[PDB]
Amino acid sequence: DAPPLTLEGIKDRVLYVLKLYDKIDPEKLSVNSHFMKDLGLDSLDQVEIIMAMEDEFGFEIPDIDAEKLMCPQEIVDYIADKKDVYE
Amino acid sequence: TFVAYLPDYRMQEWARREAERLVKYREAHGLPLMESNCFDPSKIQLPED
Amino acid sequence: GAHLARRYLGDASVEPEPLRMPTFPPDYGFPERKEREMVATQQEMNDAQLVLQQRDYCAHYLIRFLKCKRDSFPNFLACKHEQHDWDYCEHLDYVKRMKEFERERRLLQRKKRREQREADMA
Amino acid sequence: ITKDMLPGPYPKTPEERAAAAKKYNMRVEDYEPYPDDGMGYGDYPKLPDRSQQERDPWYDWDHPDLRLNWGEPMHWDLDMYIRNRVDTSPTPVNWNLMCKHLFGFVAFMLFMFWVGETYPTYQPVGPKQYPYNNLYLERGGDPNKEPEPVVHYEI
Amino acid sequence: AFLPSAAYLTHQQKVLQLYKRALRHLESRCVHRDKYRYFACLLRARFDEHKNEKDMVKATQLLREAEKEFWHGQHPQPYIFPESPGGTSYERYECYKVPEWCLDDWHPSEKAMYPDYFAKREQWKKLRRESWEREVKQLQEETPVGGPRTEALPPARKQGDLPPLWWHIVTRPRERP
Amino acid sequence: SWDKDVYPEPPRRTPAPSPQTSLPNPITYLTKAFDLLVDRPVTLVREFIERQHAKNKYYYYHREFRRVPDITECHEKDVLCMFEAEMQWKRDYKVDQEIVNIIQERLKACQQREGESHRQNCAKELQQFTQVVKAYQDRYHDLGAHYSARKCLAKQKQRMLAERKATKEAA
Amino acid sequence: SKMELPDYKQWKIEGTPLETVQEKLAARGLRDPWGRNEAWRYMGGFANNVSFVGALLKGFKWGFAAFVVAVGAEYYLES
Amino acid sequence: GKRLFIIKPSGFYDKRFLKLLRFYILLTGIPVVIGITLINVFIGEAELAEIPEGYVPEHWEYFKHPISRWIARTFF
Amino acid sequence: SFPKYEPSRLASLPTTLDPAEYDISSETRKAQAERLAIRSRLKREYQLQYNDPSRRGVVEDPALIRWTCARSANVYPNFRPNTKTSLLGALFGIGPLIFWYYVFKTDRDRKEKLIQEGKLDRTFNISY
Amino acid sequence: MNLFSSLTLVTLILLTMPIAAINFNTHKFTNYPLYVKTTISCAFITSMIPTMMFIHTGQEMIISNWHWLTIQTLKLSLSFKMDFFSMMFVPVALFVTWSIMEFSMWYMHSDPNINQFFKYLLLFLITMLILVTANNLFQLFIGWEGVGIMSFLLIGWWYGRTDANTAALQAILYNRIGDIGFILAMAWFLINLNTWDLQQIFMLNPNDSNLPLMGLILAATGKSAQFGLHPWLPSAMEGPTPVSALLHSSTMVVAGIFLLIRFYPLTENNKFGQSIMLCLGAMTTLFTAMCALTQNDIKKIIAFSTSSQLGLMMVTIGINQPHLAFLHICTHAFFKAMLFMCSGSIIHSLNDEQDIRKMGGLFKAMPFTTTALIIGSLALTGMPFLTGFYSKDLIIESANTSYTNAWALLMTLVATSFTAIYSTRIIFFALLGQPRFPTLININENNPFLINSIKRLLIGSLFAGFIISNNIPPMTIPQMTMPHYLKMTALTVTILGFILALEISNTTHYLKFNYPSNTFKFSNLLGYYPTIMHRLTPYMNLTMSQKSASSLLDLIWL
Amino acid sequence: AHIEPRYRQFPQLTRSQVIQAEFFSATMWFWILWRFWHDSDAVLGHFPYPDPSQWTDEELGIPPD
Amino acid sequence: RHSIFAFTHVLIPVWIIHYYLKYHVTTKPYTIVEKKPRIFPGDTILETGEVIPPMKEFPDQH
Ligand SMILES: CCCCCCCCCCCCCCCCCC(=O)OC[C@H](COP(=O)([O-])OCC(O)COP(=O)([O-])OC[C@@H](COC(=O)CCCCCCCCCCCCCCCCC)OC(=O)CCCCCCCCCCCCCCCCC)OC(=O)CCCCCCCCCCCCCCCCC
Ligand SMILES: CCCCCCCCCCCCCCCCCC(=O)OC[C@H](COP(=O)([O-])OCC[N+](C)(C)C)OC(=O)CCCCCCCCCCCCCCCCC
Ligand SMILES: CCCCCCCCCCCCCCCCCC(=O)OC[C@H](COP(=O)(O)OCCN)OC(=O)CCCCCCCCCCCCCCCCC
Ligand SMILES: *C(=O)CCCCCCCCCCCCC
């Protein structure tokens, strides 16, 4: 039960979610692709992506942090903060 | 250990065993088990009216 | 369950009330009516320690069934017919209660049609 | 602690109100006391009676269970509005609408049980019949007296 | 309303939070996933109908009756995540989150049970105590007159220094002890 | 044991084992296993203890209180005699309490031992219980927490005035 | 230590209820961007789940079989 | 592998108190229980008897258990 | 249109349905900025003492000390006996005492009258 | 005789021996939960022999073994009543507790306070078998307050969480409001009957027994979560799953029902007490089953299930059928403990997920859990010849054919339909359909502890009604003659509930979004009863506890 | 070897848990059909419920006057 | 040392409780009171040797 999360695992799962998203092409998506400026998404799309992260990992990101996560690396770093990875 | 082996604290056990005498004295002699008067009603002088 | 509608939505004058009945004599309509025989003796159901609800007119089947239930331990499925006998005679006692109820309802119908005949005639 | 951070009497002049609002560590516009009817609240700030359940949970609190900060002037009934106790939080249904639905439901169920007790349901049978003079000696009848005969007949 | 960094909510933040709460309460209303995904694109269309509204007073009013719409259509018991506040597993392990200073109160017979751990904890505490006065004198020259305006703290500026007010954030207990 | 008159037990009537079905019950085997494994070693240890009881036989006695004069024939405010009367009255009070407890033990054991026929078969114990509770209530109720022989005598005198007035008004 | 994730190119929403959802969205000019994320719930081993009357009747086939076996055993035993 | 340290308060002083509590209770608990067992086995429970003619018992001779007789004789 | 939410004493109005939350004026900016400033200053004054290694003890909170001193000490010296204080100290002060007095006196007079008339079933009542 | 009383006391002393073991410890344990589970298994085996030799002859007795106190006419002795109720409850309680602890060795394995958990659970078992075997009111009050306090300590197990402490104090509050009535009953029996013993209460047999029976009905209201004092049993799902499984489904919450079944010779001669029990039980079994229709936490739904079954137990006491109510207790323990165990197996498999709206697709993922959940739901609803058929249907077969409050009967039937509704709601949202849980599947159940622990209660939930109802003697006369529309009542109403809730469940796949109705808002916010009274009655206390009590009177005026 | 956690796909199943679940489902339907085949009256009815109107006035004693 | 559980936890407590109930509890009056066994027509009494006669012959119904 309760498997350990790794930055490889969190990275691969966040990118696995974003590669199943029909406004992000899977060939331009990188680990530092900014949502508004580099992938060209809306703040509505950004809220849908953070809600997809909540659907993915089974917890909630609050809105004061959901309004600032603007790359997949910030998502991986935030889940690393809230899950204590690489003990 | 002292309190557990107190010698019949306030004579309860005696009072049961004494009762086991007196009931046996008055079941056998046909008496009632307890009178309604604590003292003898012959040695009592009531105020007359 | 239709008699609940007959007593509540209809009139309670012709429907026999559950709490105090029979309101008619037991010999009224019965030439030489016999009593209800009790088979198990009072001392026999006293020693069998039966419940006061269970000491009705057919407790002797219950005494035979409980003796079978004691004697057939641990085979607890070996006395189904004695339970069937007791349940069938309790069923017949319930049928006799239904017959008393229908007797009381039909004699109240007799009284109702009697006073209606008296109001029509006189 | 010393005296000039302790509560005092009711603020009458506005400069005493400003000194208290500096003492109680809040804005002077928000600082209102309890009204000086003589009930002994003193110059304590009348906070607007919000339960601590209502607060931001994701906010970085000094006291996370209390949802309270250091130096913040607490509510007067802060022992009462903890999350183990009295809540004032918003509800999906209105307060009076809840009271009306609860009272109508409870009183109507009481009235329907009274109606069903007024009109009881039963079976189309006679009474249960017991032998031996309605089981006279079983039901605690004395052996010296003899009751009336309770005789039941076949049908 | 009540936030650590900003004193208010911007209108953009209010729109995004109302959209998120509407989708969450909608998913509570609309249990199945394809059904919620259909109504989710329908609700995304309803939110993108007036995405390009320039008038901030008209957008304020539209947001206000959108809050009335969300309050009229809310679920009574929405899906709260288990470790989210209001959840069933929320703050469950807080009785297991012992603060770190209690390790200082151990007896030396059980401190010797873990020699490498406390031998490293000594230099952790050494690091903290030679970082403290440097980060205090960092904060005293950057804070404006009247105290700091916002609750956010500056980072470590020099190389070799540590960020100010860092020990309880770094040495906080794990979420699953 | 005890005295079988003050604690009466009617003669036991157990039925014989009547095995009707061919399946062997577990209870006879468990009874034999309990008789071998449990009853025998406990009984041997008890016999050892009883031999050691026999190696020093010594006795205790039931204390007797000879009847001193009661509160009726003691003078007013004469504490040397009415102290003796009060001690006698208190010993009789505690003994009357234990008599009531004996009759309660009889009634409860009769109810359980008769089982479902307890209402039919325990009329005599219930009658004795009603009489002894009426007697104990007439003798010791409503005295208070500071009860004494004087309170009991005054209650007896008020009850005797009521009984004499009830006798007079009947004629 | 590595959990090897499967391919993101195999979660296609054709033959799913997401197909129906995208058709009914495109019928009024809408397009579904999180469908392939949802696609794993409706395919694979989780596809073709039983109904409630089929969840009740789990084991009823073999149970009725062993039932008929025991009824035949007692009917051929009673004679 | 990857065993994690569980921060907890010092369970040394509570367990030391409970070990000392059990020790200083048992220190005279076990001799008292063994002595009461030896008295109940060898010295044993006295027997009820009628008061003889002319024999006036002592006040401690009205009690059953030997430790009760010792208490009623020595201290009371 | 829609049912308007009714606030109550135990059901407060939400932050979203309050109109004054949607104030955009600069005086609300000043009030919110001063509240953020006081809160940030008190947060900093707290966590400089909280994160201090040389302190090992209790960061004393003068708002908490002030709250307890208000709940205990400030009750008598800011009292003024007037109509409101005297009437409310006579309602909940000698009201329910008189209530339970007459209730228990009535029931005990009833029970005494039933006992001296031989009415109360005091049959098996020998513990008291 | 010497076997019965000996093994009777050996069961209770054997249950107390691991408490001495955990209190006399110096080492770290060689699997103390296995030691307590082995002890309770052997205590079950020990208590089986007095039950079998009760089924042989009917042998009941009393062990008044230790004289404790004599208050002048009241000899309080340590007195154990071994009757039909103890002989059927003790093996069922020990069997259920043995399955709960083999469950807990899997479920509570991550808890570092596992020895404290098994200690507290054994303390609960000890206090409960003190309750159900007590012969006077005082020892029963000992066990009563004991299961109340162990309820407190096992609700507030995660004592850092605010909601767990809140629910535990809530449960203590409602139970002490029931204790007002229990102490009222003790006061009445001591003053008017000079006893707390059951035998003298039953032998004196008072006639003006309305007031002590009102006290006992208030005690059962506080204890069995009847209407007015109910919401602590749904609040008490904040504790761990084996806590809610053992205590708050099957063992503790039947003790108010057990208190009223224990005093049946007083209720059978008081029609007013029967009518009040019938009305309160019908009100509770309506209300809690109606609240269960629109909930989404699975522990809440099964707690409303067990409180509706307790209301049905109160109903069948209220028709003067106490032995059917106690057969329903012994029956209900098996499948309701198994339903909580299977729900918690889903919860632990799905990483602490309890909300049914994020479940589904578990028919083939968790096959044994799905099998046992379907068997537990069908035993709950009254599937023919499962264990729940052998009591509950008979309850309806005596609720129809008796001199009954008609509206209480109609609400009993509405509750019988609602049981089927929420049972197939659980099977719909949790087992059927397509998955709704998050993406990292850690679904697993292949531990012999979990599988054997659900397996033995599965054997119970299949065979135990048949075995017990063919091993118990008659204490009433079973009413077995009724018309065919009246014999087929409970089955038809249950199947109508299944059909109505399947239509409700198949209206959820439709692509429509309706505004919430007032019935949905009423039943989802729990009849508005925990929303108002949990705010209003504290408020009117605590302001009155501060303004006038402390400040006005006892600091200024007085 | 344990059940490996899997991602977005059907989890690993053991043969033993599946055959035990099918075995107890077959046990449920076996016991239901068995006691329905042998009793058939606890669900349907033990004895005939007679019609009160179909009883004659002579056995109930109704003399027509 | 394979079944020391049934010796320490069962058998020695059965010894203790049997000694307690046999020589201290049943030696005192009314401590263990037992319901007398259920007597049926046809039984044989072990304390006496007396055979209980059967019931009346049945007026058979079937
Ligand atoms: C044990 C050591 C433990 C560790 C040490 C530390 C202990 C704690 C320290 C305490 C310090 C002292 C404190 C003050 C107390 C002083 C003693 C006192 O007042 O005692 C009172 C009281 C009165 O005793 P007494 O006045 O001395 O004597 C009475 C007689 O008149 C006269 O007595 P008698 O002559 O009739 O009896 C003599 C008795 C000796 O006297 C005593 O034992 C009495 C002294 C013991 C007191 C112990 C108190 C300490 C606490 C005990 C309880 C907790 C223990 C730990 C936890 C256990 C698990 C929970 O002889 C025997 O015991 C011998 C027989 C043994 C039978 C068993 C074995 C038989 C088979 C053997 C086979 C093998 C050999 C075969 C071959 C043989 C060849 C020859 O004694 C007891 O209570 C004894 C304890 C046992 C009672 C019964 C236990 C079972 C009851 C079950 C039903 C009721 C409970 C239901 C609960 C339901 C669930 C909640
Ligand atoms: C491993 C532990 C077991 C001990 C092993 C070593 C010893 C071997 C076993 C043999 C033991 C010795 C012989 C048997 C014991 C002595 C028997 C005897 O007569 O003892 C005298 C008496 C018997 O009582 P009694 O009736 O003789 O006298 C009572 C005293 N007076 C009359 C003054 C009131 O005491 C005992 O037996 C004590 C043991 C009691 C067991 C239960 C204790 C429960 C405590 C609960 C506290 C709160 C109660 C609240 C509830 C009350 C009711 C509602
Ligand atoms: C068969 C007859 C039936 C008769 C029925 C009628 C009589 C009974 C009437 C109902 C009485 C009980 C209901 C009222 C009090 C309930 C208090 C309670 O349970 O409070 C719970 C509350 C937290 O509840 P909740 O909101 O669910 O919390 C989770 C999220 N916050 O917790 C808190 O807020 C903490 C509060 C702590 C202080 C409590 C102060 C109030 C104390 C109430 C005492 C009531 C005494 C009643 C005595 C009656 C005597 C006859
Ligand atoms: C008269 O109707 C006698 C039956 C008992 C009272 C009415 C009960 C009605 C509800 C039960 C039957 C429901 C059938 C679907």
L22, L33, L42 ranked by CB distance to F113: nearest: L33
**Burial (0-12, 13-18, 19+ Cβ within 10 Å), C65:** buried
How do beta strands J74-82 and J61-71 pair? antiparallel
Torsion from C-alpha of J122, J128, J134, J138, nearest 10 degrees: 100
Nearest CA to J154 out of J232, J243, J254, J237 is that of: J243
Eight-class DSSP state of J393: I
SS3 J70: strand
Q: Which residue has the tokens 């089947």?
A: C61
SS3 J476: coil
Q: Which ligand is nearest to the CA of F41?
A: 1
Tokens representing residue H7 in the block: 């921060």
Rounded Cα gap, residues E82 and J158, in angstroms: 14
How many other C-beta atoms lie within 10 A of the C-beta of residue A26?
Answer: 12
Catalytic residue among A42, A63, A65, A81: A42
Task: Write down the experimental method used for this entry.
Answer: cryo-EM
Chain L residues closer than 8 Å to J62 by CB: 32-34
Tokens representing residue E143 in the block: 């804070």
Do J538 and D85 meet the contact criterion of CB atoms below 8 Å apart?
Answer: yes
CB contacts < 8 Å between A and G, how many? Answer: 34
Contact at CB, J56 and F39, closer than 8 angstroms: no
- Atom 39, ligand 3: which residue's CA is nearest? J538
Rounded Cα gap, residues C114 and C120, in angstroms: 10
DSSP string, L15-52: HHHHHHIIIIITTSTTSEEEPPPPP-TT-BBTTT-PBP
| K51 interface with D at CB cutoff 8 Å | no
Rounded Cα gap, residues J58 and J83, in angstroms: 9
Contact at CB, A48 and G39, closer than 8 angstroms: no
Could you tell me which residues come within 8 angstroms of residue J525 by beta carbon, excluding any fewer than 6 positions away?
D91, D92, D93, D98, E76, E77, J531
How many other C-beta atoms lie within 10 A of the C-beta of residue J436?
Answer: 21
Chain J residues closer than 8 Å to A13 by CB: 439-440
Interface test with I, best of F104, F107, F139, F142 (most I CBs within 10 A): F142
How many other C-beta atoms lie within 10 A of the C-beta of residue J145?
Answer: 16
Name the residue ranges covered by the structural domains of chain A: 1-87
Angle formed by the axes of helices J448-469 and J367-381, to 10°? 20
Q: Kindly state if the Cβ of J184 falls inside 6 Å of ligand 3.
A: no
Chain K residues closer than 8 Å to D154 by CB: none
- From the CA of J235, give the closest atom in ligand 3: 27
Tokens representing residue E119 in the block: 């031998």
Chain G residues closer than 8 Å to A52 by CB: 34, 37
Q: Which residue has the tokens 């506890």?
A: J545
Chain I residues closer than 8 Å to E143 by CB: 44
DSSP string, J384-439: TTSTTIIIIIHHHHHHSSSSB-HHHHHHHHHHHHHHHHHHHHHIIIIISSS--S-S
Interface test with D, best of A50, A64, A82 (most D CBs within 10 A): A64
Distance from CA of B48 to the nearest CA of F (A): 9
Could you tell me which residues come within 8 angstroms of residue J452 by beta carbon, excluding any fewer than 6 positions away?
J102
How many other C-beta atoms lie within 10 A of the C-beta of residue J459?
Answer: 13
Rounded Cα gap, residues D72 and D27, in angstroms: 12
Instruction: Report resolution (Å) to 1 decimal.
Output: 2.9
CB contacts < 8 Å between G and K, how many? Answer: 52
E31, E72, E94 ranked by CB distance to J161: nearest: E94
The pair phi, psi for residue J23, each rounded to 5°, is -85, -15
Q: Which residue has the tokens 């600032």?
A: A68
Span between the terminal Cα atoms of chain I, in Å: 68
Distance from CA of H19 to the nearest CA of J (A): 7
- Amino acid of residue A37: K
**What Cα–Cα distance (Å) separates residue E132 from each residue in D79, I40, I51?**
36, 20, 9
Rounded Cα gap, residues L38 and H8, in angstroms: 62
Strand partners, J66: J78
Strand partners, F33: none
CB contacts < 8 Å between A and E, how many? Answer: 43
Do A36 and A43 meet the contact criterion of CB atoms below 8 Å apart?
Answer: yes
Q: Which residue has the tokens 């209301």?
A: J311
- Amino acid of residue J131: L
- Atom 39, ligand 2: which residue's CA is nearest? J66
Greatest Cα-to-Cα distance within chain F, rounded to the nearest angstrom: 83
H60, H62, H68 ranked by CB distance to B5: nearest: H68
Distance from CA of J216 to the nearest CA of I (A): 21
DSSP string, G1-64: -------SSS---TTSHHHHHHHHHHTTT---TTHHHHGGGSSGGGSS---HHHHHTTTHHHHH
SS3 C13: coil
H60, H62, H67 ranked by CB distance to B5: nearest: H67
Q: Which residue of G has its CA nearest to A19?
A: G8
Cis before H31 (ω within 30): no
K46, K50, K57 ranked by CB distance to C106: nearest: K57
How do beta strands J440-441 and J61-71 pair? unpaired
How many other C-beta atoms lie within 10 A of the C-beta of residue F81?
Answer: 15
Rounded Cα gap, residues H26 and H33, in angstroms: 10
Do F71 and F150 meet the contact criterion of CB atoms below 8 Å apart?
Answer: yes
Eight-class DSSP state of I73: G
Do J91 and J53 meet the contact criterion of CB atoms below 8 Å apart?
Answer: no
**Cα(J66) to centroid of ligand 2, in Å?**
6
| E144 interface with I at CB cutoff 8 Å | no
SS3 C34: coil
Nearest CA to A45 out of J250, B40, E48, F11 is that of: E48
Rounded Cα gap, residues F35 and F41, in angstroms: 10
- From the CA of J78, give the closest atom in ligand 2: 53
Rounded Cα gap, residues L37 and L30, in angstroms: 17
| C77 interface with F at CB cutoff 8 Å | no
Q: Which ligand is nearest to the CA of J196?
A: 2
SS3 F126: helix
Interface test with J, best of I69, I71, I75 (most J CBs within 10 A): I75
| F23 interface with C at CB cutoff 8 Å | yes
Say how many residues make up chain K: 65
**Cα(F95) to centroid of ligand 2, in Å?**
24
Interface of D with K in 66-125 (CB under 8 A): 124
Let me know if A42 is a catalytic residue. yes
Q: Which residue has the tokens 């109340």?
A: J148
Distance from CA of J374 to the nearest CA of C (A): 29
The pair phi, psi for residue L42, each rounded to 5°, is 115, -5
Q: Kindly state if the Cβ of J486 falls inside 6 Å of ligand 4.
A: yes
Do J459 and J379 meet the contact criterion of CB atoms below 8 Å apart?
Answer: no
Q: Which ligand is nearest to the CA of J234?
A: 3
| A16 interface with G at CB cutoff 8 Å | yes
Q: Which ligand is nearest to the CA of J197?
A: 2
Interface test with G, best of K2, K7, K8, K24 (most G CBs within 10 A): K8
Q: Kindly state if the Cβ of L19 falls inside 6 Å of ligand 2.
A: yes
Q: Which residue of L has its CA nearest to J46?
A: L10
SS3 J80: strand
Nearest CA to A5 out of H2, H5, E86 is that of: H2
**Cα(H36) to centroid of ligand 1, in Å?**
9
Q: Which ligand is nearest to the CA of J184?
A: 3
Contact at CB, D57 and E85, closer than 8 angstroms: yes
Query: How far, rounded to the nearest angstrom, does the alpha carbon of residue L46 sit from its chain's CA centroid?
Result: 13
Q: Kindly state if the Cβ of J403 falls inside 6 Å of ligand 4.
A: no
Interface of J with A in 84-123 (CB under 8 A): 110
How many other C-beta atoms lie within 10 A of the C-beta of residue G76?
Answer: 8
